[PDB]
Amino acid sequence: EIQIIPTHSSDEEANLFAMQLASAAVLPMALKAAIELDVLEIMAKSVPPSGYISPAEIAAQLPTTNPEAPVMLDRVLRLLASYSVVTYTLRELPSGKVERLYGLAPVCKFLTKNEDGVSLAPFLLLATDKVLLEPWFYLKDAILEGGIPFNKAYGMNIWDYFGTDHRINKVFNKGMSSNSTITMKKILEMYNGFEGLTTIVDVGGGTGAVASMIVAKYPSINAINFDLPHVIQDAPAFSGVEHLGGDMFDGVPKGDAIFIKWICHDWSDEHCLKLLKNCYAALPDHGKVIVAEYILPPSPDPSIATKVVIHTDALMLAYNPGGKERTEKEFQALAMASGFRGFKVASCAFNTYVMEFLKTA
Amino acid sequence: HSSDEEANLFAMQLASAAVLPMALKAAIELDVLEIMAKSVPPSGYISPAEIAAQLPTTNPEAPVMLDRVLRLLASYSVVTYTLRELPSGKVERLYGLAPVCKFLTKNEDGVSLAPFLLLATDKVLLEPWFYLKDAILEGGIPFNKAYGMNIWDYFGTDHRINKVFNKGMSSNSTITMKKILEMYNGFEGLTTIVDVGGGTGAVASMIVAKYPSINAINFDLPHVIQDAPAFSGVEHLGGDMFDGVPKGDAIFIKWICHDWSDEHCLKLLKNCYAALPDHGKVIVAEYILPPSPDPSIATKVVIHTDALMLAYNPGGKERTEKEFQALAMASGFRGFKVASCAFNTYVMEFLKTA
Numbered sequence: 001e002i003q004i005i006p007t008h009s010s011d012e013e014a015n016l017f018a019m020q021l022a023s024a025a026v027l028p029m030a031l032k033a034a035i036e037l038d039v040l041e042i043m044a045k046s047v048p049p050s051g052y053i054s055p056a057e058i059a060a061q062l063p064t065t066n067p068e069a070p071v072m073l074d075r076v077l078r079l080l081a082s083y084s085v086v087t088y089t090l091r092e093l094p095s096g097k098v099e100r101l102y103g104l105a106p107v108c109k110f111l112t113k114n115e116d117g118v119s120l121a122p123f124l125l126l127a128t129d130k131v132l133l134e135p136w137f138y139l140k141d142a143i144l145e146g147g148i149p150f151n152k153a154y155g156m157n158i159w160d161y162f163g164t165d166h167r168i169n170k171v172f173n174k175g176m177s178s179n180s181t182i183t184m185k186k187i188l189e190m191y192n193g194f195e196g197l198t199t200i201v202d203v204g205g206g207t208g209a210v211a212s213m214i215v216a217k218y219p220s221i222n223a224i225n226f227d228l229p230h231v232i233q234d235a236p237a238f239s240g241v242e243h244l245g246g247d248m249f250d251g252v253p254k255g256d257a258i259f260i261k262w263i264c265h266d267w268s269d270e271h272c273l274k275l276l277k278n279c280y281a282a283l284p285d286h287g288k289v290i291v292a293e294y295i296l297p298p299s300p301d302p303s304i305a306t307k308v309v310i311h312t313d314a315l316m317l318a319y320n321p322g323g324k325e326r327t328e329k330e331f332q333a334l335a336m337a338s339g340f341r342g343f344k345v346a347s348c349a350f351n352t353y354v355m356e357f358l359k360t361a
Numbered sequence: 362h363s364s365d366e367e368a369n370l371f372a373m374q375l376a377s378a379a380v381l382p383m384a385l386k387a388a389i390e391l392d393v394l395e396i397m398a399k400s401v402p403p404s405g406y407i408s409p410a411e412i413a414a415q416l417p418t419t420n421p422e423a424p425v426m427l428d429r430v431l432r433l434l435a436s437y438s439v440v441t442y443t444l445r446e447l448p449s450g451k452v453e454r455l456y457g458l459a460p461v462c463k464f465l466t467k468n469e470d471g472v473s474l475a476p477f478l479l480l481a482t483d484k485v486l487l488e489p490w491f492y493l494k495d496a497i498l499e500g501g502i503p504f505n506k507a508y509g510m511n512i513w514d515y516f517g518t519d520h521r522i523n524k525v526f527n528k529g530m531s532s533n534s535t536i537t538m539k540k541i542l543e544m545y546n547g548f549e550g551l552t553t554i555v556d557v558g559g560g561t562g563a564v565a566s567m568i569v570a571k572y573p574s575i576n577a578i579n580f581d582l583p584h585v586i587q588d589a590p591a592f593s594g595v596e597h598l599g600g601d602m603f604d605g606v607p608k609g610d611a612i613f614i615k616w617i618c619h620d621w622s623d624e625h626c627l628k629l630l631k632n633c634y635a636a637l638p639d640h641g642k643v644i645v646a647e648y649i650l651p652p653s654p655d656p657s658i659a660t661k662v663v664i665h666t667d668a669l670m671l672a673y674n675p676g677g678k679e680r681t682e683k684e685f686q687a688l689a690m691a692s693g694f695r696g697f698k699v700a701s702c703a704f705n706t707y708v709m710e711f712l713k714t715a
């Protein structure tokens with residue numbers, strides 16, 4: 001709490017932060033272009049001995065003959081580098097002009113395929129898709145009028161819309177599947193709560209990536225992946241997973257445990273309660289709901305981990321019917337209100353906490 | 362691996378990074394920051410509910426929805442916060458103005474950067490970004506791919522975005538030029554100044570306000586000039602600067618060179634050279650590209666603007682001081698002076714004689 005006295009110097013920084021904010025979208029939009037160009041994968045596969053590659057040497061590997069591609073790439077990569085998305089090194093030219101060569105930064109491990117063929121890049125392409133930008137033009141309308149920005153832009157809710165637009169359905173389902181594969185692989189290394197179950201139901205389990213992973217690790221479990229019919233239609237037929245289409249607000253398939261990852265955050269308290277009562281009803285006396293969600297931090301602190309949660313809260317506001325992020329006590333109160341007697345935070349990976357709503361304490 | 366954890370979380374932050382400007386846009390469109398600025402003292406805080414009470418809404422969710430937008434802003438220090446415990450043991454937030462809000466609400470003169478943000482985040486200016494991959498593989502300009510014409514021809518056809526653009530520029534330039542005019546003496550003693558590409562004339566008007574005996578000419582395309590307010594001592598004139606520019610003792614160009622290729626800059630600069638007396642000058646007001654992709658806010662503004670020029674302009678880019686020198690030399694100027702800087706904008710003089 002030392003007080004900063006306003007000066008020329010502090011005004012310069014305040015004015016420039018306002019300008020940075022004004023044009024902040026250039027970052028995710030330039031990163032989206034780089035990933036669609038396969039630039040980061042090119043960098044990963046052809047980084048010379050040194051580990052730094054020129055924009056011309058990148059552009060050489062693209063399907064282009066545009067002679068401006070190298071300078072255009074340099075300009076994109078310079079932006080990325082300023083934000084530590086790639087690294088750089090400088091080398092002096094014959095002219096005494098200085099050129100930049102670029103390398104992978106640490107974050108690139110999650111923006112290029114790992115050994116399992118997976119990354120967050122498909123998640124980025126989801127979040128920056130033209131479809132999911134459009135609701136942001138209706139956010140002020142939703143605050144004033146009530147309702148949901150997405151539904152103002154499209155005339156229907158997000159799921160119904162994905163049911164009409166095959167391109168974005170596939171982008172969405174793949175963004176979620178890849179992200180969830182990375183998180184769940186880490187969850188499964190640490191969390192033991194699937195052990196001993198004979199049946200699990202992944203409610204809102206998407207194309208079934210998670211369900212497949214749980215059965216791969218526990219071949220004695222019966223796994224049901226449950227989602228909307230337009231998602232189930234082109235879920236891979238993973239062995240040991242039964243895909244079932246339906247609407248979870250109507251009810252859910254019976255199992256020993258029900259897994260819900262990134263389901264509660266999509267829905268209002270009232271919708272969650274209805275879903276969680278349906279879950280309680282589909283479980284045996286001793287069963288549980290396994291809830292995988294972020295947890296809101298105590299304050300809007302500046303950490304990246306906090307910002308991810310808060311960013312996601314803002315995504316939920318733009319996209320979903322009452323969806324929001326919640327604190328640990330908020331999740332506990334949803335558990336209690338839907339009849340569950342026990343609550344615990346069992347595990348965490350990449351911000352995603354694994355909570356158990358226990359029918360019996 | 363907290364190391365893997367932090368790289369994964371950074372990736373997710375990047376992925377949804379558009380939430381920040383778009384959330385800020387909505388708070389500005391709602392008049393939230395202005396509400397805050399008028400409703401509590403500079404060091405005070407205000408609840409979402411008290412802000413929402415000043416909006417014309419009966420939406421019972423307005424307060425929480427504002428809370429969630431303001432929390433996003435708070436996490437980035439765009440607004441300040443303080444916590445207040447509720448009887449339930451939940452905590453709620455009250456919010457206040459951070460220093461940046463001084464440039465996102467109207468100042469003494471009635472301007473801020475808010476209209477510049479509304480420009481940059483308008484759906485029209487966002488759409489070219491979906492054609493960046495295409496421009497890189499195929500050649501050409503993302504904007505022209507989206508709209509089928511250069512940006513300036515497009516603004517002569519879309520009256521709404523013309524106004525948005527001109528106002529964004531006018532309000533940004535008013536802030537910058539007020540600060541430059543405190544420090545820079547190079548307009549002193551001139552009989553006539555011409556602001557080439559002067560938009561709706563904010564900078565010319567400020568010059569004449571400071572130096573009331575100067576004769577100022579504000580020169581731009583005719584769809585811009587038609588919207589320029591009248592200002593005593595400013596003559597508004599339409600035309601194409603590539604065909605020629607008005608004569609005067611000095612020519613001022615702010616954010617002109619950065620819109621164009623080096624070749625086009627030479628053409629412009631030679632037109633300016635020809636329009637000046639023998640010992641005249643061009644006063645160039647532009648950012649200067651820093652020598653590396655450093656993480657400073659100041660450098661990021663420049664590099665983001667280099668990226669904007671990539672998306673929008675035929676050949677436009679940001680330049681180093683030595684690049685500007687090379688432009689001055691190649692258009693016949695014999696002296697070069699870095700005279701002043703305000704809010705990243707350097708004021709360079711290209712002198713016909715040294």
Ligand SMILES: Nc1ncnc2c1ncn2[C@@H]1O[C@H](CSCC[C@H](N)C(=O)O)[C@@H](O)[C@H]1O
Nearest residue numbers: 176180204205206227228246247248261262
């Ligand atoms: N009424 C409903 N019934 C069942 N599933 C639904 C639903 N409404 C939305 N969903 C599904 O809920 C999911 C939310 S996204 C999360 C998907 C997945 N659990 C993961 O973490 O990767 C989507 O697959 C969506 O189709």
Ligand SMILES: Nc1ncnc2c1ncn2[C@@H]1O[C@H](CSCC[C@H](N)C(=O)O)[C@@H](O)[C@H]1O
Nearest residue numbers: 530534558559560581582600601602615616
């Ligand atoms: N051929 C041409 N002749 C004159 N002006 C032009 C032009 N092409 C573009 N412009 C103008 O160049 C300006 C670039 S934006 C900068 C505006 C102003 N100098 C400021 O800094 O606020 C616009 O107003 C645009 O209309």
Ligand SMILES: COc1cc(/C=C/CO)ccc1O
Nearest residue numbers: 480481486512616620669673
């Ligand atoms: C098209 O030319 C310009 C564009 C911008 C920024 C537009 C969106 O932020 C800023 C200055 C210019 O000279």
Ligand SMILES: COc1cc(/C=C\CO)ccc1O
Nearest residue numbers: 123126127158262266315319
């Ligand atoms: C519509 O529901 C969801 C949306 C997103 C949105 C964008 C992430 O790229 C994230 C998680 C969800 O459960």
